[PDB]
């Protein structure tokens, strides 16, 4: 009358629906696949990333969205300004970088 | 004996503590939030960062 009575997943009647998929399941690729829903964390938990899914995960990772910008390389002239007070923070020179400094910033970049 | 056999995931007596978690989990997020415990690195899994878990 046999030795072990070798029971299926189907039979542990209070295992969840992930639960099964995961018991049944053979690599941690296929782990991964179960547990991870958002296909842009699944693909950077899988180190396979496309350009889409790094933007994605940029959106999720960071708040601005100047540096969003600079992050993908494509900035606009607003975002260039966001941009350059976060790097510089004399007004004369802020002036300067935007390409048309005004009247008084040029009289104080000529002083400096 | 009527053979089918029905053994629920306590009746495994050398499954670990976190393997008969994931068999009675029934659905991916469920067995992601058992597999991650880093809580930054579990939401860009998910899909979904705070500014936070982006600076982390």
Same mark, same amino acid.
């Given at each position: 009358?046999?030795?072990? +009575?070798?029971?299926?997943?189907?039979?542990?009647?209070?295992?969840?629906?992930?639960?099964?998929?995961?018991?049944?399941?053979?690599? /941690?690729? $296929?782990?991964?696949?179960? +547990?991870?829903?958002?296909?842009?964390?699944?693909?950077? +938990?899988? $180190?396979? %990333?496309?350009?889409?899914?790094?933007?994605?995960?940029?959106?999720? =990772?960071?708040?601005?969205?100047?540096?969003?910008?600079? =992050?993908?390389?494509? %900035? %606009?002239?607003?975002?260039?300004?966001?941009?350059?007070?976060? =790097?510089?923070?004399?007004?004369?020179?802020?002036?300067?970088?935007?390409?048309? /400094?005004?009247?008084?910033?040029?009289?104080? =970049?000529?002083?400096?």
């Amino acid at each position: 009358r046999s030795k072990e +009575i070798s029971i299926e997943v189907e039979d542990i009647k209070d295992a969840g629906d992930t639960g099964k998929r995961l018991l049944k399941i053979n690599t /941690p690729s $296929g782990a991964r696949n179960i +547990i991870i829903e958002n296909e842009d964390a699944k693909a950077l +938990i899988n $180190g396979e %990333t496309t350009n889409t899914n790094k933007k994605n995960l940029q959106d999720l =990772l960071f708040s601005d969205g100047n540096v969003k910008a600079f =992050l993908q390389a494509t %900035t %606009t002239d607003e975002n260039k300004t966001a941009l350059q007070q976060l =790097l510089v923070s004399n007004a004369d020179v802020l002036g300067l970088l935007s390409g048309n /400094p005004t009247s008084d910033n040029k009289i104080n =970049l000529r002083t400096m």
